Design a protein around this ligand. Structure first.
Ligand code: LMT
Ligand code: LMT
Ligand code: LMT
Ligand code: LMT
Ligand code: LMT
Lengths: 111, 534, 85, 904, 129, 110
């Protein structure tokens, strides 16, 4: 009803969703054969889960001086979780990360 | 300004001029003028601040003028003043030696010496514990840069392994000191040394933290259980850098042990037996390692360990006489060891680092450095015509007075081994017929011909007719017959500090009175605590 | 704030699992992707803890840790490539 | 003060002797002989028999330069300065016709000055000073004659200091016991009669101090080899320069320590053993340089034995024999020198007995060796019969008295034997007789011996007055060769008889007792001790021989474990205040434990740096949980800037850590567990036991009122304890300069050549075309990082992060700029960073030094401009910002890549 | 007691790493030791008050003490400088960062011509005779 | 229009929690149900910004990842290397990537 209880429950469900996403991206780091599957899962998990946790935390005590420092932080988290995983996968390919035996097609030679 | 606000100028003038000598670092003449001007004005300020506290007074300046106990007190109590003047004299003479040797023209040598001097002045004048740690790091960081400055502008694998060992066992000692300060602040309320006037004889919880602090300072001072790091790091350094360090770092640790055990522990006299035991074991093991060695500058490191055991024995004999003996021994020994690393260092500059026996007859071809070495050697062994005799005699008197017969017996027997090792040096370097030796003054690894490095930029290189501080002939090996290689500019800094140790032997009452007035600030710190806290 | 404690325990369990992957990582690149996921989980823990111990000065850190969990991740890539770009 | 004036003149003689030696080549021995002897004629005449002059030297130690001229000194100064003068008169003609002889005279006259200071010593400390003065001058005199005597000089210095420093211990003991440093007040102290356990120790110490200055039983192996020096310095050192120093010390201290049994025994038995074993070895030796040394040894042994007798009748004999010996041994040495310099060799193939060229220098040796043996019409005979009369009443009962005489009779038999061998026998034109000004200074002591043996009535006043001043009582002395048949003479007709019988049977005797002797003598016992000392020192130094960190840290951790074992039973903790453990605390503890374990079990350098970053993040979360926001910020930034540097230095090193053998990880882990438990207990039992520090309550109470800022941490860092911040910014700048110096002194390892297993024509290569992701994200991360570094720099006084977080968040931007570059050439930071460090340190120290305007050093000078509290803390923050930024620039530009592009 | 468990674990990690082989494996131990020192410094300020001292009027007995926070804030920078210098030391000596070296003094003296400057007069004190 | 941004961010968070549920489902797929494959994809982006944001959007998608970018042409045509899970036929992967590229270029452009 009130304009603060909605924010409270929204932040609560948001931090729960973000924690669940972090747990899913961590379980991905266990039951995934490749480095590239791992990075493809992490690039999404570490970004979405962390943005969710940040926004939910902000909703659980919505100060007015921290809104820009969260609006910038969310975009930076997304871009960084994308680019870090991209470069980790690329450097793993260069360093010689063997792709899993269950790779149906690869248009990039490994040597 | 109140003439006590100017007490901080011992740390502000170097830190400024150093920061200046980093900006204009290519003008070697200007920076070598400014460095010696600052070192001379610092020596003058210290020798003029000695008459200020000769009446047992204690000058305390609350930095930034906050409440007593809130800010960092800068104290000056005829112990800090004596340490200031003697260490500044040592720094001045070692810089005057480095200018002639070949250092002080490399990049950032004048700034680093001034930063080390600022750190030493801070660690001496400070009155609280954590800022003492900060100033110890301010003293140690430029020391690590000076360990790479060499006469040839290069560095070897040995000279970098010694630096690794030095920084490793010093970062560990610094962090142990930090943990001790943290535990003192945890059990007590403050890190100020004054507000800990007696917080070591009231509860053992603070006594264990203060023992941790004293153990870190003992690591920094190279007492007998932790001493190999100093015997294996000082030999592998430039002859001027080791001479400059011989009187600063370990001696700042000695001053810290004195101040801490005199103020915090209040000279509790219950834990003096451990001091006696450890420091007598130091006096013994250091001189044993010395007589066992075979290198000239590696003997003096173990001798420095043994003399550190000698000095710290003055605090294990706490009282009016033991503290006086220990302070006089500190002020004499840092001067002598400076004059000893400058005489042996002046040989390693012209004749290269060799073992004992590879040279001979240097007492005939180079009488200046031979005199400067033998005077300091007899003073180190405690021979009457010099200062060390007064120090050892007062120390033996204080040891027999306190009833410590074993410590006195060790401190009087170790002089025989000290004399044996100094005579081994004198016989293997100076006595003999002058034989022709090869012109090779740089071991393979430090010379600018077998190293892929670019070398530290020399200051006297813009002339064009200089490779790395060597007079290349220009453009438009065979054994050298015995001669005089060490000019006056190289044997003069080792000789100046070799007549100080004789002026202090003949006229020693002047320094004995100041040592007594400095001890009166340790066995009775009421006038110091009453000055820092009001 | 029971939801925040639940989220903290879940993020801690995720961090522990990803650090297990860090330890038993076959290829050196797995020990870097686990480091990335753990840096992001540590930012999440910073936020959730700042919620628990109610603090206004949290997101400064959150604004900085993202500029830190990235530079300390790209560099790891720069180390897997042997320094070569 | 006239006695101190006499001593000062004796030292000024040594000060002026090099000038005379350079002016007069060798004739400089003529003025000194008439200047060092005339001084004697002054000290004897124009100074009363007992004057005490004392000038202040060191009132702190209670030491004063206090000279006394008691009759014992009145005899010993004479016997020193007269022999010194006659030796100068002899050396003026002995030395070659050279120009540079200052090194010889400046020492041989400083020897006389040091001896004068020793015998004229009423303070025990100045006595020790003159003792070591003589020992140093003697060391330097033996170091002459080239390298022939560099080892004998070292052994002489070592042996005479090992004893000359026992005298230091005796002096310090007598000073701390009797409370005063005066020889005239210590010997008459009632301590020598109260407790004999102290007088015994002092007697042993002083006997050892005088057995080394002389050459007695254990320490006799430095006189026979110190003969390598010139024969005039041997004459002085043997007549009275150093071997009489120990005897004067035994005579002076005999006033107190004469009734203590250990003194009597240690003196008598040692002196008699060395007398017998010096006379015998002089009988066996061949070179007259060794024979004279082993004869001086035996004479000093006789003297110390008759001193250890310790009765008034014994000190008279000791003094008269000291005089007789200082005469005849000096003349014997000078005559050996003259007979060597007038022929050319003392022994090259032997030499016909000196009575071949009889006129001039043969009757001199006949008058010297005769008194050395004790022939009746000489001074040696009356002195020897006085010694025998003294020894007959030695202590130890009624049996060990006459046994001492029957031992002295053996020693005197052997001494007559070797003196007769001296006068005649092989010691394996020349009509140019010794010059009248060369043989005369060598015949003055030999003739003085005769004229003092015959006219013996001239010595009883001085000798008896010098004996009642060496010990308490006095003895009516007479030296007259009276023919009253007493056992003092029956053991002198036996000496001559058995000695004649011995010298007429010399060959079978010497071929008999030589094979069955075994090496009691010989210098290979002091060299053995020096070798043992050197070996033990090498075995002690071999403990810390290896200069590797893993060992010298073990010495630190062992003492840490010892201190922990002490503190475990030492510390009793106070009750806790509140509870320092929260719910959201075990999660960060678990994350930190997991990160630390993954770091310590990581076998690859990349896993280790990843775990370092993780531990840094966990420590930042720790600092933020404890309520430290600024510290958490700085920890995050320092973690990222150390991960960057570890990557920059790991791209040059191999991929896996070095494999360390088992049974070395086990011991390391076993000591790590112990030190970890110790540190954990320390932090658990010492932290949460007090309410709040008074300085902490002050900072939280008077932060906004004193400085206008609410960020207590930043105000403490920049306003209250600004010296710590100045120190740490100088530390960082210095670390930057030191990185520059290190990478200028040694070439850093090149980036390790990783074999990229991908072919050229494939994507995921061509960094210029493949770094497009970072080269674009940096277009929005550059301005963001710059405005963030400027955001923290101004808000630092009322919000987390003042200047260090501001600077490290710009260092992160510099790391981004490095990672962004296409290749190694563009990655080099193209700004002057050494000048930036200089400017940062300058700005910091200046804005701290501007406080003197109102206050003192490092005090803010806040000035209000409308509604902004503008303060110089902002300028100090700009300074530290520049410093840290320059340090990061240097660390990234020097370590990043290789790019050797700066030199012709 | 958590601030004690973490300090103990960090100190154990330091003592282990600093005793291993390799200079980087020692710099990591020194990093852990600096972390332990910073943590025990933060523990000395009570650690029972978890509120930041950044409010307008800080409430004593409820906010964390500021002096140990400044202490760790300075020690962090100091240890960071020393760690930077140790890391740049790790990549200059030798061709690796290996630390197991023995007596290294022979490599800093001159070639030491045998016998000495006087091979005819060996010192009787040296046990090598 | 003061509450436009709130509606926008809430719609964004719904379109992101659907992606998050997709991620969580992707973490629990059985083995042999992931069929990773690499694909060279011509990007049809001119400037650097378009191609890097396309690659980031491909990575943030829970089923793909962009390894790197390069263009073997004169100065244009950007190519990317995309790795895809549960895409058993490369044509399916390229069709999904073409859909994403169209949906993005129709947004960030004139
Ligand atoms: C290489 C060694 C060189 C020679 C070393 C000479 C050391 C001589 C030390 C004499 C000190 C006399 O001072 C005395 O020291 C002893 C131990 O020694 C202390 O005695 C203490 O020692 C241990 C604890 O460690 C306990 O067994 C004892 O009960 C306790 O009192 C006395 O409290 C102190 O009065
Ligand atoms: C036996 C042979 C060796 C004997 C060695 C004797 C060496 C010393 C000689 C005695 C010195 C004469 O001592 C005289 O008295 C004063 C009173 O302290 C000494 O001391 C005086 O001079 C100097 C000042 O420059 C300081 O030591 C002191 O402040 C002052 O008291 C002086 O040095 C000297 O003027
Ligand atoms: C280089 C030679 C060194 C050998 C030195 C030996 C030192 C000799 C002792 C020096 C002092 C002699 O001691 C001195 O003896 C003379 C001469 O008998 C005495 O002299 C006194 O009696 C004698 C007669 O017997 C007469 O000269 C006169 O009646 C009166 O002067 C002095 O009262 C005494 O002071
Ligand atoms: C130059 C010297 C400087 C080095 C100084 C080193 C100081 C080291 C301090 C260690 C502290 C010792 O810590 C404490 O010491 C006290 C003092 O006897 C002793 O404490 C003792 O207290 C009571 C008596 O009051 C005993 O009944 C008890 O058994 C014991 O614990 C123990 O030893 C230890 O509890
Ligand atoms: C899978 C990895 C994560 C594992 C998680 C493990 C952490 C969960 C166990 C925590 C147990 C609870 O731990 C306990 O928390 C209580 C509060 O409830 C703390 O209690 C303390 O802080 C609370 C505030 O929170 C105060 O109100 C209380 O007065 C004080 O005592 C205790 O000091 C701590 O011991």
């Amino acid at each position: 009803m009130s304009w603060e209880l909605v924010a409270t429950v929204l932040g609560s469900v948001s931090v729960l969703v973000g924690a669940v996403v972090f747990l899913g991206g961590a379980i991905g780091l266990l039951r995934f054969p490749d480095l590239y599957v791992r990075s493809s899962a992490i690039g999404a998990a570490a970004g979405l889960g962390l943005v969710f946790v940040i926004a939910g935390a902000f909703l659980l005590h919505p100060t007015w001086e921290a809104a820009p420092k969260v609006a910038v932080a969310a975009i930076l988290q997304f871009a960084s979780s994308a680019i870090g995983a991209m470069y980790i996968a690329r450097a793993g390919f260069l360093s010689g990360a063997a792709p899993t035996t269950a790779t149906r097609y690869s248009q990039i030679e490994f040597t | 300004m109140t003439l006590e606000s100017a007490l901080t100028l011992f740390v502000a003038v170097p830190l400024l001029t150093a920061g200046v000598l980093v900006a204009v670092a290519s003008r070697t003449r200007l920076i070598l003028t400014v460095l010696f001007a600052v070192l001379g004005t610092q020596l003058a300020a210290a020798v003029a601040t000695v008459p200020w506290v000769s009446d047992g007074s204690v000058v305390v300046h609350q930095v930034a003028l906050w409440a007593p106990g809130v800010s960092i007190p800068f104290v000056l109590d005829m112990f800090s003043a004596l340490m200031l003047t003697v260490t500044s004299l040592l720094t001045l003479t070692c810089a005057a030696f480095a200018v002639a040797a070949g250092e002080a023209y490399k990049r950032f040598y004048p700034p680093l010496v001034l930063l080390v001097t600022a750190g030493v002045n801070g660690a001496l004048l400070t009155g609280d514990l954590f800022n003492f740690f900060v100033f110890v790091e301010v003293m140690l960081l430029p020391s690590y840069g000076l360990m790479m400055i060499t006469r040839s502008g290069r560095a070897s694998v040995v000279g970098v392994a010694a630096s690794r060992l030095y920084i490793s066992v010093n970062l560990l000692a610094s962090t142990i000191l930090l943990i001790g300060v943290a535990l003192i602040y945890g059990v007590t309320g403050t890190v100020n040394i004054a507000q800990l006037h007696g917080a070591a004889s009231e509860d053992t919880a603070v006594a264990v933290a203060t023992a941790l602090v004293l153990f870190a300072l003992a690591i920094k001072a190279a007492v007998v259980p932790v001493h190999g790091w100093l015997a294996r790091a000082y030999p592998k350094m430039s002859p001027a850098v080791t001479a400059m360090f011989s009187g600063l770092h370990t001696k700042i640790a000695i001053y810290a042990i004195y101040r801490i055990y005199a103020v915090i522990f209040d000279g509790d006299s219950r834990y003096l037996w451990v001091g006696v035991v450890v420091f007598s074991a130091t006096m013994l093991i250091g001189v044993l390692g010395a007589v066992g060695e075979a290198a000239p500058r590696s003997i003096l490191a173990f001798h420095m360990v043994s003399q550190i055991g000698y000095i710290l024995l003055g605090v294990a004999l706490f009282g009016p006489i033991g503290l006086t003996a220990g302070i006089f021994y500190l002020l004499h020994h840092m001067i002598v060891k400076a004059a000893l690393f400058l005489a042996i260092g002046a040989i390693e500059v012209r004749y290269g680092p060799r073992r004992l026996g590879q040279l001979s007859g240097l007492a005939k071809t180079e009488p200046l450095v031979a005199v400067a070495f033998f005077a300091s050697a007899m003073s180190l062994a405690g021979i009457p015509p010099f200062s060390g005799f007064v120090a050892k005699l007062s120390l033996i008197i204080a040891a027999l007075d306190a009833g410590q017969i074993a410590a006195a017996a060790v401190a009087v027997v170790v002089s025989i081994l000290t004399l044996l090792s100094m005579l081994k040096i004198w016989t293997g370097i100076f006595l003999g017929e002058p034989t022709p030796t090869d012109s090779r003054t740089l071991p393979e690894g430090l010379d600018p011909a077998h190293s892929e490095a670019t070398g530290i930029p020399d200051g006297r290189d813009v002339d064009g007719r200089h490779r790395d501080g060597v007079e290349i002939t220009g453009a438009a090996p065979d054994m050298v017959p015995p001669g005089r290689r060490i000019g006056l500019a190289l044997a003069a800094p080792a000789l100046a500090l070799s007549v100080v140790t004789l002026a202090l032997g003949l006229g020693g009452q002047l320094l004995l009175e100041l040592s007594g007035t400095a001890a009166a600030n340790l066995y009775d710190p009421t006038t110091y605590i009453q000055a820092v806290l009001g | 704030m029971i939801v925040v404690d639940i989220a903290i325990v879940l993020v801690a369990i995720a961090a522990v699992l990803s650090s297990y992957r860090m330890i038993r990582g076959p290829h050196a690149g797995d020990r870097a992707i686990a480091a990335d996921l753990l840096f992001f989980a540590f930012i999440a823990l910073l936020a959730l803890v700042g919620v628990r111990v109610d603090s206004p000065f949290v997101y400064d850190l959150v604004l900085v840790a993202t500029l830190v969990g990235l530079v300390s991740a790209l560099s790891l890539a720069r180390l897997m490539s042997g320094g070569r770009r | 003060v006239t006695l101190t004036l006499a001593l000062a003149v004796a030292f000024g003689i040594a000060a002026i002797s090099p000038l005379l030696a350079r002016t007069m080549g060798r004739d400089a021995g003529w003025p000194l002989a008439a200047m060092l002897g005339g001084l004697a004629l002054y000290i004897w005449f124009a100074i009363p028999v007992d004057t005490v002059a004392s000038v202040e030297w060191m009132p702190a130690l209670g030491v004063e330069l206090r000279l006394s001229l008691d009759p014992l000194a009145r005899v010993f100064t004479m016997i020193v300065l007269g022999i010194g003068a006659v030796v100068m008169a002899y050396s003026s003609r002995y030395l070659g016709r050279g120009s540079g002889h200052g090194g010889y005279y400046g020492l041989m006259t400083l020897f006389a000055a040091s001896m004068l200071g020793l015998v004229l010593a009423d303070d025990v400390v100045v006595l020790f000073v003159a003792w070591e003065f003589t020992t140093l001058c003697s060391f330097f005199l033996i170091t002459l004659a080239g390298p022939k005597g560099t080892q004998p000089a070292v052994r002489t210095l070592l042996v005479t200091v090992a004893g000359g420093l026992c005298l230091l211990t005796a002096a310090a003991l007598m000073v701390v016991r009797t409370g005063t440093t005066v020889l005239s007040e210590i010997l008459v102290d009632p301590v020598w009669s109260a407790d004999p356990a102290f007088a015994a120790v002092i007697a042993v110490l002083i006997a050892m101090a005088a057995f080394t200055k002389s050459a007695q039983f254990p320490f006799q192996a430095w006189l026979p080899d110190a003969m390598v020096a010139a024969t005039p310095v041997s004459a002085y050192l043997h007549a009275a320069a150093m071997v009489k120093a120990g005897i004067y010390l035994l005579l002076r201290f005999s006033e107190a320590l004469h009734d203590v049994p250990v003194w009597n025994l240690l003196l008598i038995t040692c002196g008699m053993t060395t007398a017998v074993l010096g006379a015998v070895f002089a009988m066996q030796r061949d070179d007259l340089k060794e024979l004279l040394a082993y004869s001086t040894i035996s004479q000093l042994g006789f003297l110390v034995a008759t001193i250890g007798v310790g009765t008034p009748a014994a000190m008279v004999a000791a003094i008269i024999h000291t005089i007789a010996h200082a005469l005849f041994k000096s003349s014997l040495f000078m005559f050996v020198g003259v007979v060597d310099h007038q022929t050319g060799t003392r022994a090259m193939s032997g030499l016909p007995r000196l009575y071949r060229i009889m006129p001039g220098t043969a009757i001199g040796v006949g008058l010297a060796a005769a008194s050395m043996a004790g022939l009746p019409p000489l001074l040696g005979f009356v002195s020897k019969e006085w010694m025998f009369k003294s020894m007959l009443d030695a202590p130890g009962g009624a049996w060990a008295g006459p046994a001492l005489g029957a031992l002295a009779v053996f020693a005197a038999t052997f001494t007559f034997a070797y003196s007769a061998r001296f006068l005649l026998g092989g010691f394996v034109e020349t009509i140019e007789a010794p010059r009248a000004s060369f043989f005369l200074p060598a015949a003055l002591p030999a003739v003085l011996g005769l004229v003092l043996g015959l006219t013996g009535f001239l010595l009883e006043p001085a000798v008896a007055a010098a004996a009642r001043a060496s010990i308490g009582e006095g003895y009516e002395a007479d030296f007259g060769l009276w023919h009253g048949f007493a056992p003092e003479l029956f053991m002198s007709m036996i000496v001559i008889t058995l000695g004649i019988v011995l010298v007429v049977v010399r060959h079978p005797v010497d071929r008999f007792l030589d094979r069955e002797l075994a090496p009691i003598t010989g210098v290979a016992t002091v060299d053995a001790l020096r070798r043992w000392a050197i070996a033990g020192g090498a075995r002690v130094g071999d403990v810390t021989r290896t200069d590797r960190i893993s060992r010298h840290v073990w010495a630190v951790l062992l003492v840490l474990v010892a201190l922990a074992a002490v503190g475990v039973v030492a510390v009793r903790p106070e009750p806790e205040v509140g509870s320092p453990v929260r719910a959201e605390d075990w999660i960060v503890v678990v994350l930190l434990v997991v990160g630390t374990a993954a770091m310590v079990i990581s076998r690859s350098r990349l896993g280790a740096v990843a775990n370092v970053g993780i531990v840094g993040f966990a420590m930042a979360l720790w600092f933020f949980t404890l309520g430290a926001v600024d510290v958490a910020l700085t920890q995050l930034l320092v973690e990222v800037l150390t991960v960057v540097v570890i990557v920059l230095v790991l791209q040059r090193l191999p991929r896996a850590f070095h494999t360390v053998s088992r049974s070395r990880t086990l011991v390391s882990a076993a000591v790590a567990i112990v030190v970890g438990l110790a540190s954990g207990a320390a932090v658990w039992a010492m932290t949460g036991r007090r309410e709040l520090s008074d300085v902490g309550r002050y900072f939280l109470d008077n932060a906004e009122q004193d400085t206008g800022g609410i960020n207590v941490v930043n105000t403490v860092l920049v306003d209250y304890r600004a010296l710590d911040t100045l120190g740490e910014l100088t530390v960082l700048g210095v670390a930057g300069l030191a990185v520059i110096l290190a990478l200028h002194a040694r070439r850093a390892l090149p980036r390790r050549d990783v074999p990229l297993a991908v072919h050229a024509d494939s994507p995921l290569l061509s960094a210029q075309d493949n770094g497009v992701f970072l080269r674009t994200f940096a277009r929005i991360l550059g301005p963001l990082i710059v405005l963030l570094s400027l955001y923290f720099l101004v808000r630092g006084h009322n919000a987390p992060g003042g200047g260090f977080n501001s600077a490290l968040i710009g260092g992160a931007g510099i790391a981004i700029y490095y990672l962004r570059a296409p290749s190694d050439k563009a990655a080099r930071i193209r700004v002057p960073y050494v000048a930036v460090i200089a400017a940062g340190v300058i700005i910091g120290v200046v804005t701290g030094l501007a406080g003197f305007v109102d206050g003192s050093f490092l005090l803010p000078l806040h000035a209000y401009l409308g509604d902004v509290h503008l303060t110089t803390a902002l300028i100090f923050d700009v300074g530290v910002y520049l410093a840290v930024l320059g340090v990061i620039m240097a660390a990234i530009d020097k370590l990043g890549g290789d790019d050797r592009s700066d030199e012709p | 007691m958590t601030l004690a468990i973490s300090v103990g674990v960090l100190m154990a990690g330091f003592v282990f790493l600093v005793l291993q082989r390799g200079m980087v494996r020692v710099i990591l131990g020194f990093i852990l030791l600096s972390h332990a020192a910073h943590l025990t410094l933060m523990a000395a300020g009570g650690a029972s008050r978890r509120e930041a001292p950044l409010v307008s009027d800080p409430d004593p007995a409820l906010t964390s003490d500021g002096l140990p926070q400044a202490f760790v804030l300075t020690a962090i920078v100091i240890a960071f400088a020393i760690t930077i210098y140790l890391l740049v030391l790790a990549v200059i000596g030798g061709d690796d960062d290996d630390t197991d070296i023995g007596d290294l003094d022979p490599l800093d003296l001159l070639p030491e011509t045998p016998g000495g400057a006087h091979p005819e007069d060996p010192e009787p004190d040296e046990p090598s005779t | 229009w003061p509450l436009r941004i709130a509606w926008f961010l809430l719609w964004f968070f719904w379109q992101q929690t659907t992606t998050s549920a997709k991620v969580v489902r992707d973490a629990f797929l059985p083995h042999a149900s992931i069929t990773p494959g690499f694909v060279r994809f011509p990007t049809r982006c001119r400037s650097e910004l378009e191609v890097t944001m396309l690659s980031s959007l491909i990575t943030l998608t829970p089923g793909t990842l962009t390894l790197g970018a390069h263009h073997p042409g004169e100065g244009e045509d950007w190519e990317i290397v995309v790795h895809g899970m549960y895409f058993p036929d490369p044509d399916d992967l390229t069709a999904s990537l073409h859909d994403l590229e169209n949906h993005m270029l129709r947004a960030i452009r004139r």
